[PDB]
Amino acid sequence: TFRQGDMSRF
Amino acid sequence: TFRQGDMSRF
Amino acid sequence: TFRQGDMSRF
Amino acid sequence: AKYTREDIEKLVKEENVKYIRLQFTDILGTIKNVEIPVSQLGKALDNKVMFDGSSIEGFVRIEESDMYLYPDLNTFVIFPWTAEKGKVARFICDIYNPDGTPFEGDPRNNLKRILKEMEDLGFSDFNLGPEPEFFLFKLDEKGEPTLELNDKGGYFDLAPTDLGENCRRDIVLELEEMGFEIEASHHEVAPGQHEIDFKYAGAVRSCDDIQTFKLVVKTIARKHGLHATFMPKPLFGVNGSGMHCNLSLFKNGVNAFFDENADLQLSETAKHFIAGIVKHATSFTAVTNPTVNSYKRLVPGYEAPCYVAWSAQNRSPLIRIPASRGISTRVEVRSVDPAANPYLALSVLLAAGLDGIKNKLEAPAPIDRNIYVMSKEERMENGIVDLPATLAEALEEFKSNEVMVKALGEHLFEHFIEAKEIEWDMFRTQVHPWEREQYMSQY
Amino acid sequence: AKYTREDIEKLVKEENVKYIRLQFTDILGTIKNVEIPVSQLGKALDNKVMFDGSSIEGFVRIEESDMYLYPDLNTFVIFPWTAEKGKVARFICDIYNPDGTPFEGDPRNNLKRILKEMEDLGFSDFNLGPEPEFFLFKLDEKGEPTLELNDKGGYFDLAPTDLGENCRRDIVLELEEMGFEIEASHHEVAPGQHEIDFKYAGAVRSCDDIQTFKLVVKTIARKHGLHATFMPKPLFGVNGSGMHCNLSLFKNGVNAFFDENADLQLSETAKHFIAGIVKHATSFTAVTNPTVNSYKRLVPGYEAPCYVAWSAQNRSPLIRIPASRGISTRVEVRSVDPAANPYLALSVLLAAGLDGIKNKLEAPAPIDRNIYVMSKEERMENGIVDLPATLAEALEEFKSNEVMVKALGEHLFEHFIEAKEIEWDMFRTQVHPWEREQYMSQY
Numbered sequence: 003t004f005r006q007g008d009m010s011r012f
Numbered sequence: 013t014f015r016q017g018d019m020s021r022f
Numbered sequence: 023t024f025r026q027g028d029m030s031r032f
Numbered sequence: 033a034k035y036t037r038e039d040i041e042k043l044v045k046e047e048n049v050k051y052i053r054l055q056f057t058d059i060l061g062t063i064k065n066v067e068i069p070v071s072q073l074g075k076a077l078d079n080k081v082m083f084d085g086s087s088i089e090g091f092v093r094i095e096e097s098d099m100y101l102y103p104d105l106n107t108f109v110i111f112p113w114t115a116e117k118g119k120v121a122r123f124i125c126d127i128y129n130p131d132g133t134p135f136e137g138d139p140r141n142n143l144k145r146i147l148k149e150m151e152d153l154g155f156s157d158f159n160l161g162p163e164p165e166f167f168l169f170k171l172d173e174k175g176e177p178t179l180e181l182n183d184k185g186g187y188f189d190l191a192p193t194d195l196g197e198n199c200r201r202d203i204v205l206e207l208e209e210m211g212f213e214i215e216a217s218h219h220e221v222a223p224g225q226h227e228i229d230f231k232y233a234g235a236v237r238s239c240d241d242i243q244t245f246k247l248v249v250k251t252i253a254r255k256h257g258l259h260a261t262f263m264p265k266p267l268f269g270v271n272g273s274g275m276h277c278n279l280s281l282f283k284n285g286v287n288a289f290f291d292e293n294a295d296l297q298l299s300e301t302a303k304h305f306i307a308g309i310v311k312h313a314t315s316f317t318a319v320t321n322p323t324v325n326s327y328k329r330l331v332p333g334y335e336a337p338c339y340v341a342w343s344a345q346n347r348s349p350l351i352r353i354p355a356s357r358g359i360s361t362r363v364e365v366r367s368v369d370p371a372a373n374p375y376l377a378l379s380v381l382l383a384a385g386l387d388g389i390k391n392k393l394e395a396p397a398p399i400d401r402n403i404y405v406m407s408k409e410e411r412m413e414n415g416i417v418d419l420p421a422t423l424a425e426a427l428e429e430f431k432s433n434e435v436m437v438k439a440l441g442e443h444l445f446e447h448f449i450e451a452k453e454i455e456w457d458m459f460r461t462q463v464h465p466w467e468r469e470q471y472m473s474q475y
Numbered sequence: 476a477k478y479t480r481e482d483i484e485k486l487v488k489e490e491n492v493k494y495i496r497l498q499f500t501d502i503l504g505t506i507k508n509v510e511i512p513v514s515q516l517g518k519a520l521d522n523k524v525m526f527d528g529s530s531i532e533g534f535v536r537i538e539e540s541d542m543y544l545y546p547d548l549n550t551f552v553i554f555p556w557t558a559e560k561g562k563v564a565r566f567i568c569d570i571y572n573p574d575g576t577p578f579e580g581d582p583r584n585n586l587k588r589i590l591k592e593m594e595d596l597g598f599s600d601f602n603l604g605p606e607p608e609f610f611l612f613k614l615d616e617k618g619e620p621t622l623e624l625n626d627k628g629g630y631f632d633l634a635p636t637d638l639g640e641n642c643r644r645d646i647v648l649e650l651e652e653m654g655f656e657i658e659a660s661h662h663e664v665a666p667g668q669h670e671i672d673f674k675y676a677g678a679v680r681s682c683d684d685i686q687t688f689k690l691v692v693k694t695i696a697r698k699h700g701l702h703a704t705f706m707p708k709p710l711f712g713v714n715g716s717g718m719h720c721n722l723s724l725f726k727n728g729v730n731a732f733f734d735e736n737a738d739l740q741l742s743e744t745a746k747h748f749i750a751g752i753v754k755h756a757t758s759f760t761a762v763t764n765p766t767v768n769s770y771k772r773l774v775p776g777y778e779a780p781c782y783v784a785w786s787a788q789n790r791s792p793l794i795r796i797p798a799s800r801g802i803s804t805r806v807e808v809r810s811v812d813p814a815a816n817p818y819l820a821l822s823v824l825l826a827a828g829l830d831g832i833k834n835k836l837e838a839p840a841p842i843d844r845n846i847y848v849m850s851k852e853e854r855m856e857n858g859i860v861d862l863p864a865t866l867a868e869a870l871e872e873f874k875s876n877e878v879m880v881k882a883l884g885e886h887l888f889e890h891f892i893e894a895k896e897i898e899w900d901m902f903r904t905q906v907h908p909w910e911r912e913q914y915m916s917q918y
């Protein structure tokens with residue numbers, strides 16, 4: 003996790 | 013009876 | 023009770 | 033005076049009015065009129081138009097009776113809705129017997145009689161500031177009211193906003209263009225509930241403005257595809273609708289309720305008025321709350337009054353005294369609902385207040401400790417008594433009060449009692465759907 | 476000053492305004508008003524309009540209370556949406572007791588009191604620059620919000636493009652036409668999420684602009700067939716909406732946070748302010764994050780803060796210090812969400828900062844090590860603590876803090892606590908569809 007909003011495009 | 017037209021609203 | 027209209031939104 | 037005969041004739045001459053409504057108010061408070069062409073304006077202004085005076089009695093009329101239709105010149109109003117070929121104007125008229133005596137069965141004449149009695153006590157004016165509130169219901173395809181509210185607004189909320197709609201704003205502006213003196217407006221506690229406050233004026237003028245306000249609000253709401261109702265409690269579990277009445281008594285042009293050197297800045301006359309209102313509160317409830325639905329509003333938990341007490345700051349007091357003082361010193365009676373006849377309600381309130389003043393009754397101590405906390409027996413030992421719970425109970429209380437009987441005279445008393453007894457009898461024998469939902473399958 | 480009385484009368488005279496909204500803000504932050512006709516403008520400007528001041532308390536109001544409606548002349552704004560017969564203008568007003576004392580229950584008056592306390596410490600101005608984020612949802616045929624976003628945009632993307640739509644562009648231009656000072660705008664990280672930044676201004680002016688911005692954004696989005704919401708976290712698994720607050724303290728007209736000869740180019744006053752904010756961060760979270768949904772945003776992985784720390788460059792720090800220095804030296808608090816009451820949030824933030832300044836508290840070391848890597852126990856031994864996880868926990872923390880209680884006074888404290896406790900109790904007893912999806916078939 004720790005990065006979900008940015009990588010939500012995938 | 014004796015009053016039907018006036019009391020017809022009820 | 024004692025307060026129903028004010029808390030009616032909930 | 034505001035208008036004279038020449039002014040009226042000239043105004044109708046240029047404005048090209050063809051229809052004149054000589055409107056008046058019956059026992060039940062609904063607006064009645066007889067209509068004449070503009071060619072009969074001269075006969076109307078001569079106090080010569082006859083009509084059936086029994087129409088004031090409502091549905092309990094038994095015999096036709098000829099009455100005169102003396103119009104009031106100061107009430108002349110031109111309706112903004114043109115009737116195609118010509119405009120429509122209205123007069124609010126008094127009812128007179130064929131011998132020239134004012135008709136004792138006219139609520140407006142009864143209010144004038146009570147005001148004359150007040151002037152006999154040394155006072156000059158009796159000002160009323162009303163706070164009528166109403167609900168707005170959406171209409172369906174067939175143009176009949178539904179149970180859906182126009183907005184899910186709140187107390188003093190900016191709910192309607194801009195971008196069209198805002199029927200309250202349109203009503204306020206239109207009333208301003210008709211000569212009304214609107215003080216302020218806001219969204220009420222319940223969804224789809226609104227309030228518009230007028231500036232205080234004389235009692236007769238205030239009642240006339242109340243009737244005109246009801247008519248105009250209904251018409252404008254109908255224009256916007258909405259239904260406006262002054263029903264005291266259209267929905268269960270939701271805030272009701274009141275017509276809080278701010279009463280101020282004037283003597284020699286100054287407020288008689290104000291006394292800077294007394295406690296609460298209240299004069300002895302104000303205390304006597306409060307005592308008079310308290311003493312007869314359970315008796316005039318039948319007049320100020322004349323419908324069966326009126327007593328579904330008088331239930332605890334919705335800020336409507338339920339007990340006879342007065343206060344400066346309390347949860348739902350019967351009598352509230354606003355913080356403003358001086359010329360604006362007034363006593364507010366919050367039991368009145370918009371369904372009440374304004375003339376009759378003002379008559380009974382003024383009669384109770386004068387009874388308090390005439391006998392110098394002692395006002396009870398104000399309550400500031402939330403009477404709702406204790407039980408009914410835990411407060412009966414004090415001066416706090418309960419308002420009538422049903423229309424029949426209020427009718428029983430009203431009949432027994434000798435003073436309140438003369439507040440509206442024998443004719444009005446008998447006809448009002450007969451009509452209300454018939455209304456209650458029709459209600460008590462009905463089988464409501466609630467009963468079937470509760471007992472059809474259980475038993 | 477920007478407007479005088481004569482300017483107000485002249486402007487309404489040419490612009491032909493008929494409706495005036497005397498708007499104010501309650502405890503929950505929703506915009507309330509009492510509306511008057513233009514004929515009452517003279518009475519309004521005389522600080523004589525009365526209203527029920529209990530409406531500030533919201534749904535926890537008990538008793539009617541009369542208060543005055545002192546308007547602010549500099550807040551006069553003419554709404555661009557003409558209301559048929561005449562225009563609409565607004566005043567943002569302060570609430571005053573009938574004796575002329577400002578009402579202690581008014582959030583705006585509370586903010587003014589906190590600003591007076593700040594001036595008593597030698598400082599002159601407290602500037603705020605907000606970064607409100609909002610979502611745009613498409614409306615359905617019945618004109619109610621749906622769960623579909625207006626665009627599949629990204630961070631700083633040129634997603635809306637030309638050829639119509641671009642509701643953000645229209646909002647920015649319209650706000651510019653109304654006198655707002657828009658700094659910059661961009662598409663936010665989440666799809667259908669947008670941000671518009673204002674120029675920094677005074678605290679009271681900034682809060683008034685925030686309220687007006689919410690109103691205008693909602694209205695314009697409604698015009699474009701869209702729903703604009705400032706909900707902190709409308710959707711799960713998607714970035715939430717924040718209202719990052721850039722705070723700058725001025726002394727004698729110069730920035731008091733800037734010191735060219737110190738490390739990080741930061742003055743000792745700035746370090747004391749940061750220490751004060753850090754000390755009370757867990758306590759004022761209930762005010763800056765007043766809703767149940769506010770704490771669904773405060774979860775890791777979406778750039779929202781979750782721990783009490785300050786830094787110059789880090790992943791989701793509670794306090795961030797922008798690289799710009801000199802006049803533009805400021806401290807950014809990123810925990811604030813747009814659902815917070817601007818006046819109350821600014822009051823508690825300023826109170827915490829002044830508490831840090833008054834007691835000369837020592838700021839902790841900045842965090843530049845990605846505390847998300849280390850465990851909660853692996854960071855508890857440091858000065859890093861977690862923000863409250865739920866609204867109830869934040870309420871418990873807020874009650875215990877003595878300084879934050881005086882930050883808004885006893886009246887606001889009791890009413891806010893009561894309202895938030897009722898709100899939490901309503902939420903915790905509900906059975907959500909997630910529970911049925913998880914347990915109805917499994918058990």
Ligand SMILES: NC(=O)CC[C@H](N)C(=O)O
Pocket residue numbers: 165220221271272273274329334335336337366
């Ligand atoms: N909060 C109010 O003033 C509303 C009064 C309430 N609707 C009543 O029926 O009396």
Ligand SMILES: NC(=O)CC[C@H](N)C(=O)O
Pocket residue numbers: 608663664714715716717772777778779780809
């Ligand atoms: N990139 C950003 O600054 C977005 C911030 C994030 N949306 C929040 O809620 O704090």
Ligand SMILES: [Mg+2]
Pocket residue numbers: 163165220227
């Ligand atoms: Mg009201």
Ligand SMILES: [Mg+2]
Pocket residue numbers: 163276364366
């Ligand atoms: Mg009232």
Ligand SMILES: [Mg+2]
Pocket residue numbers: 606608663670
């Ligand atoms: Mg952002």
Ligand SMILES: [Mg+2]
Pocket residue numbers: 606719807809
């Ligand atoms: Mg930011």
